[PDB]
Amino acid sequence: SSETFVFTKDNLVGNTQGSFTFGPSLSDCPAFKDGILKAYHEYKITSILLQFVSEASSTSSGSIAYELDPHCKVSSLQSYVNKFQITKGGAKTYQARMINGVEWHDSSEDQCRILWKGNGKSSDSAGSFRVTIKVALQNPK
Amino acid sequence: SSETFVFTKDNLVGNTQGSFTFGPSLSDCPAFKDGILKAYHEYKITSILLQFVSEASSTSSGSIAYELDPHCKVSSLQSYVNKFQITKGGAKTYQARMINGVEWHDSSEDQCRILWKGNGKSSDSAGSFRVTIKVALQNPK
Amino acid sequence: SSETFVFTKDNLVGNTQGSFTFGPSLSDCPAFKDGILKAYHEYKITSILLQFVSEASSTSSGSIAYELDPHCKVSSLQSYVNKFQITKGGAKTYQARMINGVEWHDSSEDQCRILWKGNGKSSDSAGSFRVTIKVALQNPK
Amino acid sequence: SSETFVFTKDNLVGNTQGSFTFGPSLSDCPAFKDGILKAYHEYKITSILLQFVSEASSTSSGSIAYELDPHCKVSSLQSYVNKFQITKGGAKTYQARMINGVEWHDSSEDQCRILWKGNGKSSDSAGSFRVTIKVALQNPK
Amino acid sequence: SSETFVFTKDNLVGNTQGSFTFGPSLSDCPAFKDGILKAYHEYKITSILLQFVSEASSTSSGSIAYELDPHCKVSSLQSYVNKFQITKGGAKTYQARMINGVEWHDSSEDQCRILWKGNGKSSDSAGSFRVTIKVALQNPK
Amino acid sequence: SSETFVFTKDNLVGNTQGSFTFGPSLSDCPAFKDGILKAYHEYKITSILLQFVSEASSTSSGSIAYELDPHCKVSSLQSYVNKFQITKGGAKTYQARMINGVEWHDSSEDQCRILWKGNGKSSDSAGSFRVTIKVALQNPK
Amino acid sequence: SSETFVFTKDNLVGNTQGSFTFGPSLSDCPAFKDGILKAYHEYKITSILLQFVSEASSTSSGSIAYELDPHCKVSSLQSYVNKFQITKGGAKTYQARMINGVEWHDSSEDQCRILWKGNGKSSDSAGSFRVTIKVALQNPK
Amino acid sequence: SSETFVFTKDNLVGNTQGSFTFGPSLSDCPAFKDGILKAYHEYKITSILLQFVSEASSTSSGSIAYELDPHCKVSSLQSYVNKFQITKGGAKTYQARMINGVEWHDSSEDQCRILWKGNGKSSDSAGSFRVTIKVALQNPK
Amino acid sequence: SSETFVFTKDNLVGNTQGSFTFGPSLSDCPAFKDGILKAYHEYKITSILLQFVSEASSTSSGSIAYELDPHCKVSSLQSYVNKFQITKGGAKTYQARMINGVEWHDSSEDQCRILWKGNGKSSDSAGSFRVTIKVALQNPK
Amino acid sequence: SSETFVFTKDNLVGNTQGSFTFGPSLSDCPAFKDGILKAYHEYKITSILLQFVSEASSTSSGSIAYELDPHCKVSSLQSYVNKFQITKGGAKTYQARMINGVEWHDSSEDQCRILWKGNGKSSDSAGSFRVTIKVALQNPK
């Protein structure tokens, strides 16, 4: 009973922060939060495609960094290894073994938490994060 | 992005009535009503397996009748051709061409409406209707 | 009797809105509106290639969002999942099964309605939307 | 549960008009109007063979025109492309894809409407239209 | 982007005259005149099937003559070589090399002009000329 | 006796206009205007590669539109279907059948006329149009 | 309906001039001028064999030059590239692609114009130009 | 970008002299002098076919001699090894290695200079020298 | 016992300088400096992928240059051959033979030193240098 | 004894000019000027890769043009056919036959001269021209 869910993030300022805690704590996708997840005992997210779609001016400087965090144990970013540019948007595709997606998780367990943090100005705009998850569910409820 | 949904109906009295209006009007499966259906533009239900699982006494007489109604245009049963027995439960599997399931339907359109009506006593119990739908969705939202 | 039609949209401001209701309600392509469509009973649009060709400055911030809406039932955008950037233009190709293009439609029936809505400034310019439709028609009139 | 129905039209004057609205509005075939159609939920007409069998004098001038109209949306002819001659009768065979006969229609939905209009005299006679439909029905009622 | 267009001529008297100047001067097919032709720079008509469908009495004498004229340079018939009979209708199929249909023509250039002239009575009727053109267009506008 | 000719257009302002009337009216390539063309009776241009090479600032907004016009009959643009962006330059390759390049043309006949028209500011600069034509000539003079 | 026509030019003086404008302006071949050409709408000349048959003395100096001119646009010679000798006569065979003989021409259109001009004395004699054309005609009139 | 050029020499007297300095100093072929050569940086002439086409009387005595001179360093003939006869004309074909045609030459460099000198009378006429060069050019300008 | 290490450089100003002295002198990767390197006698770095990930405005001019220096013997850049652009970031992958990575190095020996030096402004920002090294170690300690 | 040489050009202003006269007159590569060239009698440059590596702001307008000039005979540009953009840098690879690199040149002979000329502002910066030559030398000295 696999299903894909596409959800977006709103008009983002350049120094934005946040976290996509996947599972029953996605406030940004209610069709997965209290939609398909209330009708099954256990799930796992097979893949996560996180996409930064930037409507930003070409004179805006900065870069929005992100980390995967496969076990939901951090609340800030704390690691600036890989990052998107605010002018030129990007995309990152996470497979199953990266995102704790090989074992079945209970429907009250968060799976993984992608976090971001930008360093741009507090007046520019880079509203983005089209996110496409592929989730599989097996035990109906 | 296909997905199966299993939902049940509660403790049924012998002279029960009702309707399973599939689509955005299933009050009996919220994980399909305002779950996966709010995250896609259009859907179609590929198959419907309606199962009558009877916990009824062997001295209870009656038979619960049902009809398919592939276009949601009737509110009562009005046709007693095929039916389940209250003592011996049954099962009926509907494929795609029977249930208006060959074309994509908008996510505010009801697809088909299975109706039932029993003729048993108002004191017996035959709580049943394990229903398993296979639905496909394509245009994310 | 297949035929391709290319039509454009005019000088677009950055916060533009609108809708391309395909069929007999395209005000932007009269050669399909009251041209080839008045000489046939029924049609279907096999494919739609919507292209955003941006003549915009590299210091203009914003992003024009769009949705497909395969059944003409919405008048505003209401979904910001996928979008073009105003600086870097884009292209999106819709096949037949996405755009209600598998069954023949009567020549007074609108088929699908692509909508857009931008979030840029009301002074910038991103004049765009070269649209190429492939339509098939069979029953002459 | 396929079945063929042959019905005729009466003694036709040379300037005759009319329409064969197929489905539950055929007044000219009651064995399909309130016969086999009241015992099934949904139908589709697989083929329509319309035949003009003319008993007309060889000195009568005129030609009876006809159109298919696969979606019941016109009440007059309005298109004189193809036509029968009043002296020499004819025949026209419509397959499934022409007559909106690929999807199942509800038993209160008209499917297609063949219309005719002649230009002969109001005193001649060309009584005709042996019509043979092949209809399939699946969901009993 | 090839397309076929079928258009007819109205109730014809026996001594009828006229001309089918193909291209942007067909007054008898607006779906080709200001329909598909306004959306392309250049075209060519691949084939022309001219058909005389006669609803005429068998006591009406006469014959409607026609000529091809592949370059639009004559306004009357002036050549009675080939002709249809008013009682027994006919058909003539013109390929590409006959009708100046090997090179691309601009969308303000008439291609060829089929002319007819009958010698029957001014009271009889032979309403006819179902014409089917196959046109190809390449450069969108 | 095939030969390729590369010629450029000068320092272009953002709202530029013009036309490349190919043949004996190219004022921008004298080596083809009164060079190789005075020594042959007839020619044809096999291909035309029009390239927009932009030295423009990334804060300059606008887009230079162009059309092919295979028969030299228009003096303004009048069609804004396809276009280059002033910031990001482009390229368009026209084959033989598009540009009236299948038949031999006399050396006093213009073949085709590519036109452009921009909508940028009258102070910016996008000096461009490296054009490469492939021409064949056969009858010496 | 192909046909060959052989026509000659009269007693030529050594400094002769002229032109063979092929089509409806050949004054030197009336069997092609107002013979076979009045009975067809369109023609094309498949080949032209121009032969210089010299009855000239071996002490006469000079050379008669000629050019092809595939589009009837020049009235004098203006090009002395290839030429016959007045003493030793010659022959030149022109195929279809040289003489504008690949497309059908209307019967009031001149096709090509071979011109000659000699430089001999005004008292010598070289009477010549046996010309053999192969012409094809298709649309009768 | 290879191309062939055919140019002739005018009415020649029997004791004629001259030189064909190939490259940018051909006064006898302007379509190569300031035609195709102004649009390329560098060239080389692949072959030279020099042909003596004599319209001379059979009682005129003499012989026009010629030399190749692959490096443009002589202004008179100075070598009478090979020669044409004034009565019987001739032809000489020079390949690439003879005429300094293996390396690319700049477009302001003369390549080779064929010279001639006749010994006939100053009253006879042998107007001739149909010359056909095959030139290749590579670097556009 | 191969292992990959990804480390980044902080918020970089446009005129930044520095050096990545690989081995026991990486102050920017302590998990390789006094992590895995204290537990082995000898190592070698198999590959180095240096990536410039720019969050810089599109109106910032400059270019950050870099050199490899396979033997740690220079402290400034002194060579501006290859370089990244501050607006458009880049990537450079160094294999084993380039970076002195074919022989085993002692764990107190620096291997190679990549240096950079930019020429941008002292107010812009291009924070970058995601560096991924692949190191192999063999002799435990 | 082939060898590659990489040399750069310094901090370039937007309206820069110059020339790379290859051979013993490269002032920008002394390791080829009075390095390897003083130890051999004759050389030839097999290939030249000229690369424009731009550290320029995205609001700087202009384009730096260049020409090849395979024989060192021009001192200014004089031809604006192909060019780089100042914002988006580029690359051009010249093979052996383009750059006079098929014959051996003496070590006091310049081979070819690439010239450039920009049209940008006199205050912007686009410091660039990483040039990589492949040279072969055979006769030691």
Numbering used by the authors:
A (entry chain A), B (entry chain B), C (entry chain A), D (entry chain C), E (entry chain B), F (entry chain A), ...: 68 to 208
Question: What does the article say, verbatim?
Answer:
The Luteoviridae are an important family of pathogenic viruses responsible for necrosis of the plant vasculature which, in turn, causes severe stunting and dwarfism, and ultimately crop loss. The structures for BYDV and PLRV each reveal a luteovirid capsid composed of 180 CP monomers. The CP monomers each contain a single canonical jellyroll fold, and are arranged with T = 3 icosahedral quasi-symmetry to give a particle with a diameter of ∼30 nm. The luteovirid capsids are formed from CP subunits with a canonical jellyroll fold comprising two opposing β sheets, each containing 4 antiparallel β strands (βB-βI).
We therefore present high-resolution structures for VLPs of BYDV and PLRV at 3.0-Å and 3.4-Å resolution, respectively. BYDV and PLRV CPs assembled into monodisperse, homogeneous particles of the anticipated diameter. When imaged in ice, both BYDV and PLRV VLPs were monodisperse, so cryo-EM datasets were collected for each (see STAR Methods). Structure refinement was carried out with icosahedral symmetry imposed, yielding density maps at a resolution of 3.0 Å for BYDV and 3.4 Å for PLRV. Density maps for each structure were of sufficient quality and resolution to allow for unambiguous building of the shell (S) domain of the CP (BYDV: residues 61–200∗; PLRV: residues 68–208). In both cases the N-terminal R (RNA-binding) domain is not resolved in the cryo-EM density, except in the “C” conformer of BYDV, where an additional six residues of the R domain (residues 55–60) are visible. We have also solved the structure of VLPs formed by an N-terminally His-tagged version of PLRV CP to 3.4-Å resolution, since the formation of His-tagged VLPs were previously reported (Lamb et al., 1996). No differences were found between the structures of the VLPs formed by tagged and untagged CPs. For instance, mutations in the CP of PLRV that affect aphid transmission can now be rationalized (Kaplan et al., 2007). The triple mutant D95E, P97A, K100S had no impact upon capsid formation, but decreased transmission efficiency, suggesting that this region of the CP may be important for transmission. Our structures show that D95, P97, and K100 are situated within α1 and the preceding loop, and all three side chains are surface exposed, where they could, for example, affect binding of the virus to receptor(s) in the aphid vector.
